[PDB]
Amino acid sequence: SMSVKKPKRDDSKDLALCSMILTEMETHEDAWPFLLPVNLKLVPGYKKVIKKPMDFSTIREKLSSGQYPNLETFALDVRLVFDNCETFNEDDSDIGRAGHNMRKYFEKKWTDTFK
């Protein structure tokens, strides 16, 4: 509350560490469905169904231009990529499986880096 603060967690490395995580996600072999925005002209249904499209390139640009106020807003966009993927793709599809694998991969790196 006013004049009463928890001890200051060092957040000065967060930008760099989120960048490294994002690099590792970008270079994973199963990243291919997620590297670029879904083409809303060429994929029937996507525009109407997925209210908040997100992809790794868009996260990378937001990261690089100071549009994440903290590491939680960064994790929310990453998870949005996988939540969207589950909304639109069957679990038993190459893309559906990619999304589960990438989410697992991300969540481990997240825990190991920050928790």
From Swiss-Prot:
Signal peptide: none
Locations listed in the record: Nucleus
Tissue: Expressed at varying levels in several tissues, whereas a smaller transcript was expressed specifically in testis.
Cystine residue pairs: none
Bromo domain residues: 9-113
Function, as annotated: Regulatory subunit of the ATP-dependent BRF-1 and BRF-5 ISWI chromatin remodeling complexes, which form ordered nucleosome arrays on chromatin and facilitate access to DNA during DNA-templated processes such as DNA replication, transcription, and repair. Both complexes regulate the spacing of nucleosomes along the chromatin and have the ability to slide mononucleosomes to the center of a DNA template. The BRF-1 ISWI chromatin remodeling complex has a lower ATP hydrolysis rate than the BRF-5 ISWI chromatin remodeling complex.
Subunit structure: Component of the BRF-1 ISWI chromatin remodeling complex, at least composed of SMARCA1 and BAZ2B, which regulates the spacing of histone octamers on the DNA template to facilitate access to DNA. Within the BRF-1 ISWI chromatin remodeling complex interacts with SMARCA1; the interaction is direct. Component of the BRF-5 ISWI chromatin remodeling complex, at least composed of SMARCA5/SNF2H and BAZ2B, which regulates the spacing of histone octamers on the DNA template to facilitate access to DNA.
Similarity comment: family membership: Belongs to the WAL family.
Protein's recorded name: Bromodomain adjacent to zinc finger domain protein 2B
Lineage: Eukaryota, Metazoa, Chordata, Craniata, Vertebrata
Residues of the full protein shown: 2054 to 2166 of 2168
